[PDB]
Amino acid sequence: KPFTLPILTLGELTNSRFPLPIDVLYTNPNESAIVQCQNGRCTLDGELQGTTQLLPTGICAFRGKVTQQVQDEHRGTHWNMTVTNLNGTPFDPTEDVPAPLGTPDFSGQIYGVISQRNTNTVPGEGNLPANRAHEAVIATYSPKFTPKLGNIQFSTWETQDVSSGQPTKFTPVGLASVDANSHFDQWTLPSYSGALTLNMNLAPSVAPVFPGECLLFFRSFIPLKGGYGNPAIDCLMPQEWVQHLYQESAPSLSDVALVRYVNPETGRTLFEAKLHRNGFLTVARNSAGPVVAPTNGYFRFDSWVNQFYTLAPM
Amino acid sequence: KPFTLPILTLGELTNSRFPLPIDVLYTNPNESAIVQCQNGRCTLDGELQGTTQLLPTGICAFRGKVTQQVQDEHRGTHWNMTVTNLNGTPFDPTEDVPAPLGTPDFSGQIYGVISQRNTNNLPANRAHEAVIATYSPKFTPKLGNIQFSTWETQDVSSGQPTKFTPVGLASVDANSHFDQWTLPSYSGALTLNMNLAPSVAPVFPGECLLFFRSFIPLKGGYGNPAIDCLMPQEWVQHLYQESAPSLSDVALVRYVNPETGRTLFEAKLHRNGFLTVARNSAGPVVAPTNGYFRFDSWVNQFYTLAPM
């Protein structure tokens, strides 16, 4: 089975860490933080890792049931939610994953909509269930965010209309805030089992080992409920690459695949990158910021090489 | 290039008409309405049709700018927004498409979130729940603008980049006019829709359409509304990239339980991008979620399917 990448352009790709279109290719060589995201993780031979699952709709989504309302001391309202697998089967905490697949992989206040459709139906209404939906926020840094243990909290404002014991869905939309008290850090993992407990079954950290190389990201800008900022989420590979690699199941012939970013019209190679076996890109670039490239560009497999390969500078 | 389908299971597929996972396979042989949806339309050789585009995030999404607030008789606050192409380039009304790609293809009150990030050292932001009534005379995406409503707020800015993220439906009551097979009037009242993907139907006696069905969330009220697509979004992505020539009008496909390796049933995959089966009943197809369709062979118009 030979190795291929999708021929989709940047304008035809979506983020694997949040439901957003890919906006630009991006580098930041001076990044201090360890890069160890858990969504959008897939080895080149098709092995999904971390909390990665195949559905674009699954990314940062939750399914479950609400158990109780609790106020915080600052008068906000919170709801305890038990969570299942996204397909509705019970989550087995002993499954060899960090948390249910699709769980958010960063610290922050994730803004979205909670919706419910009741199990019980009303004969007088055509045997049809009641429904409700509201804006909600999930603080992944909260001590009550323990998805590996099978439950989390979400907050709402000005409503009591959330039902207990009824099927509940979280649809992610963006971030509530990126101010200091909102603790947004895209590279800081949640404590999936809460404080004092170690995260387990993590996808490994990724880094360039090669001098003058840096990680290359697929970057998307994420909406905000309010306040100031222009937050971004960077993924190692787009969701469509995850879908492609998984289906392909192509054996990796070496630890590194040389790939070319090509302008199909001219046929010219704009630049080269290393696609590492664990599923990430590095380039020879010494600056931070977007990569300016024609809208018709995409990566194409060239050959299997090794760690000692020297890329041409961007 | 020989013809292939993705090996993704039902539990690994998403709807091409709304951003939802596929829940079940579904049939309804006695459906009165003409089936002519415009999203999730792709020929077997990879040609996108109607308003279909490749992004899962693009389906029933809008991008544009709010121009001003509008008053009318209905409760809540209302806003006009210009809409562009999803990639932010201006929409050219002369483009040979029914409306900007990703535009909703059905009548109803679509519930979602409007968000803004100001153009003019950090920009200001706001987001709110919103509803877009696709049956409204002010829904004119082909002309480059639409209207949306919000629950009482003044906190929407004019002249700022605006995004609509779809979530579900506001309601399915009689006055909310939900009909998944009724197309919007893309250019407004009294105007003909143009450049439509064609209607689809079974040609063969005893055959019916097979749909990939998703249930769609509701802001309020009673109901269990569903959206049916001809092919899932991953099939659109795959067919588009594959670009495999169609050797006949119909491809025979098998629904296999890969684990047993047995064929649960067979279907016809038509050149225009839709499935038919020999079934005489309505409702879900009860099958394991790990099943998937596999290409068998190209056949002809006279091929007879085994009943399901």
Coordinates of C-alpha atoms in Angstrom, one line a residue:
Chain A
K1 CA 0.0 0.0 0.0
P2 CA 1.7 3.2 -1.3
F3 CA 1.5 6.4 0.7
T4 CA -0.8 9.3 -0.3
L5 CA -2.1 12.5 1.1
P6 CA -5.4 14.1 0.2
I7 CA -5.3 16.6 -2.7
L8 CA -7.6 19.1 -0.8
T9 CA -6.4 22.7 -0.7
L10 CA -6.2 24.8 2.5
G11 CA -9.6 26.2 1.6
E12 CA -11.0 22.7 1.5
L13 CA -9.5 21.5 4.9
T14 CA -10.9 21.8 8.4
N15 CA -9.2 21.9 11.9
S16 CA -8.9 18.6 13.8
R17 CA -8.9 20.3 17.2
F18 CA -12.0 22.5 16.9
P19 CA -14.8 22.6 14.3
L20 CA -13.3 25.4 12.1
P21 CA -12.0 25.8 8.6
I22 CA -8.2 26.0 8.1
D23 CA -7.2 29.6 7.6
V24 CA -3.5 29.6 7.2
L25 CA -0.3 27.5 7.5
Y26 CA 1.7 28.8 10.5
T27 CA 5.0 28.6 12.3
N28 CA 6.2 29.7 15.8
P29 CA 9.8 28.5 16.3
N30 CA 10.2 30.2 19.7
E31 CA 7.3 28.5 21.3
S32 CA 8.1 27.7 24.9
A33 CA 5.4 25.1 25.6
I34 CA 5.5 21.4 25.1
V35 CA 3.3 20.5 22.1
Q36 CA 1.2 17.5 23.0
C37 CA -2.4 18.0 21.7
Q38 CA -4.6 14.9 21.9
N39 CA -7.1 15.6 19.1
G40 CA -5.9 15.5 15.5
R41 CA -3.4 12.8 16.4
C42 CA -2.9 10.0 13.9
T43 CA 0.2 8.1 12.8
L44 CA 1.0 7.9 9.1
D45 CA -0.1 4.3 9.0
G46 CA -3.5 5.2 10.2
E47 CA -3.4 4.7 13.9
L48 CA -5.6 7.2 15.8
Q49 CA -4.1 8.4 19.1
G50 CA -5.1 10.4 22.2
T51 CA -8.7 11.4 22.1
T52 CA -8.9 11.5 18.3
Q53 CA -12.0 10.2 16.5
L54 CA -13.1 10.5 12.9
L55 CA -16.2 12.7 13.0
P56 CA -15.8 16.4 12.3
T57 CA -18.9 16.8 14.5
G58 CA -17.3 14.9 17.3
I59 CA -14.4 17.3 18.0
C60 CA -15.0 19.1 21.4
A61 CA -18.5 17.6 21.5
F62 CA -20.1 15.8 24.5
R63 CA -23.1 13.5 24.9
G64 CA -24.7 12.6 28.3
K65 CA -27.3 13.5 30.9
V66 CA -27.6 16.3 33.5
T67 CA -27.8 15.2 37.2
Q68 CA -28.0 18.4 39.3
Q69 CA -27.8 22.2 39.5
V70 CA -25.1 23.8 41.6
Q71 CA -24.4 27.5 42.2
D72 CA -20.8 28.8 42.7
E73 CA -20.1 31.3 45.4
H74 CA -20.0 34.1 42.8
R75 CA -23.7 33.3 42.0
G76 CA -23.0 31.5 38.6
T77 CA -25.1 28.4 37.7
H78 CA -23.5 25.1 37.0
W79 CA -24.9 21.7 35.9
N80 CA -23.4 18.3 36.6
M81 CA -23.3 16.2 33.5
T82 CA -22.4 12.5 33.2
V83 CA -20.9 11.8 29.8
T84 CA -21.0 8.8 27.6
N85 CA -19.1 7.9 24.4
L86 CA -20.2 10.1 21.5
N87 CA -22.2 7.1 20.0
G88 CA -24.2 6.9 23.2
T89 CA -22.6 3.8 24.6
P90 CA -21.4 4.0 28.2
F91 CA -17.9 5.3 28.6
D92 CA -15.7 2.7 30.2
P93 CA -13.1 4.6 32.3
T94 CA -10.7 1.7 31.9
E95 CA -10.6 2.2 28.1
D96 CA -7.0 2.9 27.0
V97 CA -7.7 6.5 26.1
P98 CA -7.1 9.7 28.1
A99 CA -10.8 10.6 28.0
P100 CA -13.9 9.9 25.9
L101 CA -12.9 10.4 22.2
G102 CA -13.6 14.0 21.1
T103 CA -13.0 15.5 24.5
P104 CA -11.4 19.0 24.3
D105 CA -7.6 18.9 24.5
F106 CA -6.8 22.4 25.9
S107 CA -7.3 24.7 28.9
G108 CA -10.0 27.3 28.4
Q109 CA -13.7 28.3 28.6
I110 CA -15.3 26.5 25.7
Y111 CA -18.5 28.2 24.5
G112 CA -21.3 26.3 22.8
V113 CA -24.9 25.2 23.0
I114 CA -26.4 22.6 25.2
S115 CA -29.5 20.9 23.7
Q116 CA -31.8 18.2 25.0
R117 CA -34.4 15.9 23.5
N118 CA -36.5 14.1 26.1
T119 CA -36.7 10.3 26.1
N120 CA -40.3 10.4 27.2
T121 CA -42.9 11.4 24.7
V122 CA -46.4 12.9 24.9
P123 CA -49.4 11.0 23.3
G124 CA -51.4 14.3 22.9
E125 CA -48.4 15.8 21.0
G126 CA -48.2 13.0 18.5
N127 CA -46.0 10.9 20.7
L128 CA -43.3 13.6 20.4
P129 CA -40.7 14.7 22.9
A130 CA -40.1 18.1 24.5
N131 CA -36.9 20.0 23.7
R132 CA -34.7 22.8 25.0
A133 CA -31.4 24.4 24.2
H134 CA -29.3 27.2 25.7
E135 CA -25.8 28.8 25.5
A136 CA -23.4 27.1 27.8
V137 CA -19.7 27.2 28.8
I138 CA -17.4 24.4 29.8
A139 CA -14.3 25.3 31.8
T140 CA -11.8 22.5 31.0
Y141 CA -9.4 23.7 33.7
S142 CA -12.1 23.3 36.4
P143 CA -11.6 20.8 39.2
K144 CA -15.1 19.5 38.2
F145 CA -13.9 18.8 34.6
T146 CA -13.3 15.0 35.0
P147 CA -14.3 13.4 31.7
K148 CA -12.1 10.4 32.3
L149 CA -14.2 9.7 35.4
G150 CA -17.3 10.1 33.3
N151 CA -18.5 13.5 34.3
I152 CA -18.2 17.3 33.8
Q153 CA -19.9 20.6 34.6
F154 CA -21.2 23.3 32.3
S155 CA -22.4 26.8 33.1
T156 CA -25.4 28.7 31.9
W157 CA -26.8 32.2 32.6
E158 CA -30.3 33.4 33.4
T159 CA -32.0 30.1 32.9
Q160 CA -33.4 27.3 35.1
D161 CA -34.7 25.4 32.1
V162 CA -32.2 22.5 32.0
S163 CA -33.7 19.1 32.7
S164 CA -32.2 16.2 34.7
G165 CA -32.1 12.6 33.4
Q166 CA -32.6 13.7 29.7
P167 CA -30.3 13.1 26.8
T168 CA -28.0 16.1 26.4
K169 CA -25.7 17.3 23.6
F170 CA -22.9 19.9 23.6
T171 CA -22.3 21.6 20.3
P172 CA -19.1 23.6 20.4
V173 CA -19.0 27.1 18.9
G174 CA -16.0 29.0 20.2
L175 CA -14.4 30.4 23.4
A176 CA -16.3 32.4 26.1
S177 CA -13.3 34.6 26.8
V178 CA -9.5 34.8 26.5
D179 CA -8.9 37.2 29.5
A180 CA -6.6 36.1 32.3
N181 CA -9.2 34.6 34.5
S182 CA -10.4 32.5 31.5
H183 CA -7.2 30.5 31.4
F184 CA -6.9 29.9 27.7
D185 CA -3.8 28.0 26.7
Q186 CA -4.0 25.8 23.6
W187 CA -1.0 23.7 24.7
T188 CA -2.0 23.1 28.3
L189 CA -3.8 19.8 28.7
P190 CA -6.8 19.4 31.0
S191 CA -6.5 17.1 34.0
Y192 CA -8.9 14.5 32.6
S193 CA -9.3 12.8 35.9
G194 CA -8.9 16.0 37.9
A195 CA -6.2 17.4 40.1
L196 CA -3.8 15.0 41.8
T197 CA -4.3 12.3 39.1
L198 CA -2.0 11.7 36.2
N199 CA -3.3 11.8 32.6
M200 CA -2.9 8.4 30.9
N201 CA -2.7 6.9 27.4
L202 CA -1.6 10.3 25.9
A203 CA -0.5 10.8 22.4
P204 CA 3.2 11.6 22.6
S205 CA 4.7 15.1 22.5
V206 CA 6.0 16.3 19.2
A207 CA 9.1 18.5 18.4
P208 CA 11.7 19.1 15.8
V209 CA 15.0 17.4 16.7
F210 CA 16.8 19.0 13.8
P211 CA 18.6 22.4 14.1
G212 CA 16.8 25.2 12.2
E213 CA 13.6 23.2 11.9
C214 CA 10.3 24.1 13.5
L215 CA 6.8 22.7 13.7
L216 CA 4.3 23.6 10.9
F217 CA 0.7 24.0 11.9
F218 CA -2.7 24.3 10.3
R219 CA -4.1 27.3 12.0
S220 CA -7.7 28.4 12.5
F221 CA -9.2 31.4 14.3
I222 CA -11.8 30.6 16.9
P223 CA -14.9 32.7 17.7
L224 CA -15.4 34.6 21.0
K225 CA -18.6 35.1 23.0
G226 CA -17.3 38.5 24.2
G227 CA -14.3 40.6 25.1
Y228 CA -11.1 41.4 23.3
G229 CA -8.8 39.1 21.4
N230 CA -8.1 37.1 18.2
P231 CA -7.5 33.5 19.5
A232 CA -6.2 30.7 17.3
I233 CA -6.1 27.0 17.4
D234 CA -3.3 25.1 15.7
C235 CA -3.5 21.5 14.6
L236 CA -0.8 19.1 13.5
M237 CA -2.8 17.7 10.6
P238 CA -6.3 18.6 9.4
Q239 CA -9.3 16.4 10.1
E240 CA -9.4 15.3 6.4
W241 CA -5.8 14.0 6.7
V242 CA -6.9 12.0 9.8
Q243 CA -9.8 10.5 7.8
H244 CA -7.5 9.7 4.8
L245 CA -4.6 8.2 6.8
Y246 CA -7.0 6.0 8.8
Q247 CA -8.6 4.6 5.7
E248 CA -5.4 4.2 3.7
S249 CA -3.6 2.1 6.4
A250 CA -0.4 2.5 4.4
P251 CA 2.7 1.1 6.1
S252 CA 5.3 3.7 7.0
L253 CA 8.6 2.8 5.3
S254 CA 10.7 5.1 7.4
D255 CA 10.3 7.6 10.3
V256 CA 10.0 10.6 7.9
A257 CA 8.2 11.2 4.6
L258 CA 9.4 14.1 2.4
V259 CA 6.5 16.1 1.1
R260 CA 6.3 19.0 -1.3
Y261 CA 3.9 21.9 -1.1
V262 CA 3.0 22.3 -4.8
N263 CA 1.3 24.8 -7.0
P264 CA -0.5 22.3 -9.3
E265 CA -1.0 24.9 -12.0
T266 CA 2.7 25.6 -12.5
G267 CA 3.8 22.3 -11.0
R268 CA 6.5 24.2 -9.0
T269 CA 7.4 23.2 -5.4
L270 CA 6.8 26.2 -3.1
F271 CA 8.6 24.5 -0.2
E272 CA 9.5 21.2 1.3
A273 CA 8.5 19.7 4.7
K274 CA 9.2 16.6 6.7
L275 CA 6.0 14.6 7.5
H276 CA 7.0 12.6 10.6
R277 CA 5.7 9.1 11.3
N278 CA 3.8 10.1 14.5
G279 CA 1.8 12.5 12.3
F280 CA 3.2 16.1 12.2
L281 CA 5.2 18.4 10.0
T282 CA 8.4 20.3 10.3
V283 CA 10.0 22.8 8.0
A284 CA 13.3 24.7 7.8
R285 CA 12.0 28.2 8.7
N286 CA 13.5 30.8 11.1
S287 CA 10.5 33.1 11.5
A288 CA 7.0 33.1 13.1
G289 CA 3.7 33.8 11.4
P290 CA 1.6 32.7 8.4
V291 CA 3.1 31.0 5.4
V292 CA 2.0 33.0 2.3
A293 CA 1.1 30.6 -0.4
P294 CA -1.3 30.4 -3.4
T295 CA -4.8 29.2 -2.7
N296 CA -4.5 26.2 -5.0
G297 CA -1.6 24.6 -3.0
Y298 CA -1.5 21.3 -1.3
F299 CA 1.1 18.8 0.0
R300 CA 2.2 15.9 -2.1
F301 CA 4.2 12.8 -1.0
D302 CA 7.6 12.7 -2.6
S303 CA 9.6 9.9 -0.9
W304 CA 10.6 8.2 2.3
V305 CA 13.7 9.8 3.8
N306 CA 15.2 9.8 7.3
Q307 CA 15.8 12.1 10.3
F308 CA 19.1 13.4 8.8
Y309 CA 17.5 14.8 5.7
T310 CA 18.2 18.5 5.2
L311 CA 15.3 20.6 4.0
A312 CA 15.7 23.6 1.8
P313 CA 15.0 26.8 3.7
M314 CA 11.7 28.5 3.3
Chain B
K1 CA -9.1 5.2 -12.1
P2 CA -11.3 2.4 -10.8
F3 CA -14.3 3.3 -8.6
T4 CA -14.2 3.2 -4.8
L5 CA -16.2 4.3 -1.8
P6 CA -14.8 5.2 1.6
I7 CA -14.5 2.3 4.1
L8 CA -15.9 4.5 6.9
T9 CA -18.7 2.9 8.9
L10 CA -22.1 4.5 9.6
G11 CA -20.8 5.6 13.0
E12 CA -17.9 7.4 11.2
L13 CA -20.0 9.4 8.8
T14 CA -21.6 12.8 9.0
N15 CA -24.6 14.5 7.2
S16 CA -24.0 16.6 4.1
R17 CA -27.1 18.8 4.6
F18 CA -26.5 19.7 8.3
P19 CA -23.5 19.4 10.6
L20 CA -24.7 16.2 12.4
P21 CA -23.5 12.6 12.7
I22 CA -25.3 10.0 10.6
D23 CA -27.7 8.2 12.9
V24 CA -29.5 5.6 10.8
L25 CA -30.1 4.5 7.2
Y26 CA -33.8 5.3 6.3
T27 CA -36.4 4.8 3.6
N28 CA -39.8 6.4 2.9
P29 CA -41.3 5.0 -0.4
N30 CA -44.6 6.9 -0.2
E31 CA -43.0 10.4 0.1
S32 CA -45.2 12.8 -1.9
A33 CA -42.6 15.6 -2.2
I34 CA -40.1 16.0 -5.0
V35 CA -36.6 15.2 -3.7
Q36 CA -34.3 17.9 -4.9
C37 CA -31.9 18.9 -2.1
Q38 CA -28.9 21.1 -3.1
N39 CA -26.4 20.2 -0.4
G40 CA -24.6 16.9 -0.5
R41 CA -25.0 16.7 -4.3
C42 CA -22.1 15.1 -6.2
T43 CA -21.9 12.9 -9.2
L44 CA -20.1 9.6 -9.0
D45 CA -17.2 11.0 -11.1
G46 CA -16.7 13.8 -8.5
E47 CA -18.6 16.8 -9.9
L48 CA -20.2 18.9 -7.1
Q49 CA -23.7 20.3 -7.9
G50 CA -26.2 22.7 -6.4
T51 CA -24.8 24.6 -3.3
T52 CA -22.5 21.7 -2.3
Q53 CA -19.0 22.5 -1.1
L54 CA -16.3 20.4 0.6
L55 CA -16.1 21.8 4.2
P56 CA -18.1 20.0 6.9
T57 CA -18.0 23.4 8.7
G58 CA -19.4 25.1 5.6
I59 CA -22.8 23.3 5.6
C60 CA -25.6 25.8 6.5
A61 CA -23.0 28.4 7.4
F62 CA -22.8 32.0 6.4
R63 CA -20.1 34.6 6.3
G64 CA -20.6 38.3 5.8
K65 CA -21.2 41.6 7.5
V66 CA -24.1 43.1 9.5
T67 CA -25.4 46.2 7.8
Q68 CA -28.1 47.5 10.1
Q69 CA -30.8 46.6 12.6
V70 CA -34.3 46.1 11.3
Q71 CA -37.7 46.3 13.0
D72 CA -40.8 44.3 12.1
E73 CA -43.9 42.8 13.8
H74 CA -42.2 39.8 15.3
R75 CA -40.8 39.7 18.8
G76 CA -37.0 39.8 19.2
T77 CA -34.5 41.9 17.4
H78 CA -33.8 41.6 13.6
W79 CA -30.6 42.3 11.5
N80 CA -29.7 42.5 7.9
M81 CA -26.4 41.0 6.9
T82 CA -24.6 40.9 3.5
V83 CA -23.2 37.4 2.7
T84 CA -20.1 36.6 0.8
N85 CA -18.6 33.3 -0.3
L86 CA -17.5 31.2 2.7
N87 CA -13.8 32.0 1.9
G88 CA -14.6 35.7 2.3
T89 CA -14.4 36.6 -1.4
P90 CA -17.4 38.5 -2.7
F91 CA -20.3 36.4 -4.0
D92 CA -20.8 36.9 -7.7
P93 CA -24.6 36.7 -8.3
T94 CA -23.8 35.6 -11.9
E95 CA -21.9 32.5 -10.7
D96 CA -23.7 29.4 -12.0
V97 CA -24.9 28.2 -8.6
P98 CA -28.3 28.6 -6.9
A99 CA -26.7 30.6 -4.0
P100 CA -23.4 30.9 -2.2
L101 CA -22.0 27.4 -1.6
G102 CA -23.1 26.0 1.8
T103 CA -26.4 28.0 1.8
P104 CA -29.2 26.0 3.6
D105 CA -31.3 23.9 1.1
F106 CA -34.6 23.6 3.1
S107 CA -37.4 25.6 4.5
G108 CA -37.3 26.3 8.2
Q109 CA -36.1 28.4 11.2
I110 CA -32.4 27.5 11.4
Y111 CA -31.1 28.1 14.9
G112 CA -27.4 28.9 15.5
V113 CA -24.9 31.4 16.8
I114 CA -23.9 34.7 15.2
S115 CA -20.4 35.8 16.1
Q116 CA -18.4 38.8 15.2
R117 CA -14.7 39.8 15.4
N118 CA -14.2 43.5 14.7
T119 CA -11.9 44.7 11.9
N120 CA -10.2 47.6 13.6
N121 CA -4.3 46.2 20.1
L122 CA -6.9 43.4 20.3
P123 CA -10.3 43.5 18.4
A124 CA -13.7 43.5 20.2
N125 CA -16.0 40.4 19.9
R126 CA -19.5 39.4 20.5
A127 CA -21.7 36.3 19.9
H128 CA -25.4 35.5 20.4
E129 CA -28.0 32.9 19.6
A130 CA -29.8 33.7 16.3
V131 CA -32.4 32.3 14.0
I132 CA -32.6 32.5 10.2
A133 CA -35.9 31.9 8.6
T134 CA -35.1 30.5 5.1
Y135 CA -38.7 30.8 3.9
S136 CA -38.7 34.6 4.6
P137 CA -38.9 37.1 1.8
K138 CA -35.8 38.7 3.3
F139 CA -33.9 35.4 2.8
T140 CA -32.1 36.3 -0.5
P141 CA -28.6 34.8 -0.4
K142 CA -28.4 34.7 -4.2
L143 CA -28.7 38.5 -4.1
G144 CA -26.0 38.7 -1.4
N145 CA -28.0 39.3 1.8
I146 CA -30.2 37.7 4.4
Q147 CA -31.9 38.6 7.6
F148 CA -31.5 37.0 11.0
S149 CA -33.2 37.4 14.4
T150 CA -31.8 37.5 17.9
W151 CA -33.4 37.3 21.3
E152 CA -33.7 40.9 22.6
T153 CA -30.2 42.4 22.4
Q154 CA -28.6 45.5 20.9
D155 CA -25.2 43.9 21.1
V156 CA -24.7 43.3 17.4
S157 CA -22.4 45.7 15.6
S158 CA -22.9 47.1 12.1
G159 CA -20.1 46.8 9.5
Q160 CA -18.2 44.1 11.3
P161 CA -17.2 40.6 10.1
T162 CA -19.9 38.2 11.0
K163 CA -20.2 34.4 11.1
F164 CA -23.2 32.1 11.4
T165 CA -22.6 28.7 13.1
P166 CA -25.6 26.4 12.6
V167 CA -26.7 24.3 15.6
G168 CA -30.3 23.1 14.9
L169 CA -33.8 24.3 14.4
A170 CA -35.6 27.0 16.4
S171 CA -39.0 25.2 16.2
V172 CA -41.0 22.7 14.1
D173 CA -44.4 24.1 14.9
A174 CA -46.8 25.0 12.0
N175 CA -45.7 28.6 11.8
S176 CA -42.0 27.7 11.7
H177 CA -42.5 26.1 8.3
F178 CA -40.1 23.2 8.5
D179 CA -40.0 21.1 5.4
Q180 CA -36.7 19.5 4.5
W181 CA -37.8 19.0 0.9
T182 CA -39.0 22.5 0.2
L183 CA -36.3 24.6 -1.3
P184 CA -35.9 28.3 -0.2
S185 CA -36.4 31.0 -2.8
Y186 CA -32.8 32.0 -3.1
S187 CA -33.5 35.3 -4.8
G188 CA -36.7 36.0 -2.9
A189 CA -40.4 35.9 -3.5
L190 CA -41.7 35.6 -7.1
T191 CA -38.3 34.7 -8.5
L192 CA -37.2 31.4 -10.1
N193 CA -34.4 29.4 -8.5
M194 CA -31.5 28.7 -11.0
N195 CA -28.7 26.3 -11.6
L196 CA -30.3 23.6 -9.4
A197 CA -29.0 20.1 -8.9
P198 CA -31.7 17.8 -10.5
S199 CA -34.4 16.0 -8.6
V200 CA -33.8 12.3 -7.8
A201 CA -36.2 9.4 -7.9
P202 CA -36.3 5.6 -8.3
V203 CA -36.8 4.4 -11.9
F204 CA -37.3 0.7 -11.2
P205 CA -40.5 -0.9 -10.0
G206 CA -40.4 -1.7 -6.3
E207 CA -37.4 0.5 -5.6
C208 CA -37.2 3.4 -3.2
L209 CA -34.6 6.1 -2.3
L210 CA -32.2 5.2 0.6
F211 CA -31.2 8.1 2.8
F212 CA -28.6 8.7 5.5
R213 CA -30.6 10.2 8.3
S214 CA -29.6 12.5 11.2
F215 CA -31.8 13.9 13.9
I216 CA -31.5 17.7 14.4
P217 CA -31.5 19.6 17.7
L218 CA -34.4 21.9 18.7
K219 CA -34.2 25.2 20.6
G220 CA -37.7 24.5 22.0
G221 CA -41.1 22.9 21.6
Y222 CA -42.1 19.3 20.7
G223 CA -40.7 17.2 18.0
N224 CA -38.0 14.9 16.7
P225 CA -37.0 16.5 13.4
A226 CA -34.7 14.7 11.0
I227 CA -32.6 15.7 8.0
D228 CA -32.0 13.1 5.2
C229 CA -29.1 13.3 2.8
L230 CA -28.4 11.3 -0.4
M231 CA -24.7 10.7 0.5
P232 CA -22.7 11.6 3.6
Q233 CA -20.2 14.5 3.5
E234 CA -17.3 12.0 3.5
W235 CA -18.6 10.4 0.3
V236 CA -18.7 13.9 -1.3
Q237 CA -15.1 14.5 -0.3
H238 CA -14.0 11.1 -1.5
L239 CA -15.8 11.2 -4.9
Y240 CA -14.5 14.7 -5.5
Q241 CA -10.8 13.6 -5.0
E242 CA -11.3 10.2 -6.7
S243 CA -12.5 11.8 -10.0
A244 CA -13.2 8.2 -11.3
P245 CA -15.1 8.0 -14.6
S246 CA -18.6 6.4 -14.4
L247 CA -18.6 3.3 -16.5
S248 CA -22.4 3.0 -16.5
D249 CA -25.5 4.7 -15.1
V250 CA -25.5 2.5 -12.0
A251 CA -23.0 1.0 -9.6
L252 CA -24.1 -2.1 -7.7
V253 CA -23.0 -1.8 -4.1
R254 CA -23.1 -4.1 -1.1
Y255 CA -23.8 -3.2 2.5
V256 CA -21.4 -5.5 4.4
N257 CA -20.9 -6.4 8.0
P258 CA -17.1 -6.5 7.6
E259 CA -16.8 -8.5 10.8
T260 CA -19.0 -11.4 9.5
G261 CA -18.0 -10.5 5.9
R262 CA -21.6 -11.1 4.9
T263 CA -23.7 -8.8 2.7
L264 CA -26.7 -7.5 4.7
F265 CA -28.3 -6.0 1.5
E266 CA -27.5 -4.6 -1.9
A267 CA -28.3 -1.2 -3.4
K268 CA -27.9 0.8 -6.6
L269 CA -25.6 3.8 -6.5
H270 CA -26.8 6.0 -9.4
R271 CA -24.5 8.2 -11.5
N272 CA -26.1 11.4 -10.2
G273 CA -25.1 10.5 -6.6
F274 CA -27.9 8.7 -4.8
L275 CA -29.0 5.3 -3.6
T276 CA -32.0 3.1 -4.3
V277 CA -33.0 -0.2 -2.7
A278 CA -35.7 -2.7 -3.2
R279 CA -37.8 -2.1 -0.1
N280 CA -41.6 -1.8 0.4
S281 CA -41.6 -0.2 3.9
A282 CA -40.8 3.1 5.6
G283 CA -38.5 3.6 8.5
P284 CA -35.0 2.9 9.8
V285 CA -32.8 0.1 8.4
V286 CA -31.8 -1.9 11.4
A287 CA -28.2 -2.8 11.0
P288 CA -25.0 -2.6 13.0
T289 CA -23.3 0.8 12.9
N290 CA -20.0 -0.7 11.8
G291 CA -21.4 -1.7 8.5
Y292 CA -20.5 0.1 5.2
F293 CA -21.1 0.1 1.5
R294 CA -18.6 -1.5 -0.9
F295 CA -18.5 -1.2 -4.7
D296 CA -19.3 -4.4 -6.4
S297 CA -19.6 -3.7 -10.1
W298 CA -21.1 -1.4 -12.8
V299 CA -24.4 -2.6 -14.0
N300 CA -27.2 -1.6 -16.3
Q301 CA -30.8 -0.2 -16.1
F302 CA -32.3 -3.6 -16.1
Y303 CA -30.6 -4.9 -13.0
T304 CA -32.9 -6.4 -10.4
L305 CA -31.9 -6.0 -6.7
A306 CA -32.7 -8.6 -4.1
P307 CA -35.3 -7.3 -1.7
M308 CA -33.9 -6.1 1.7

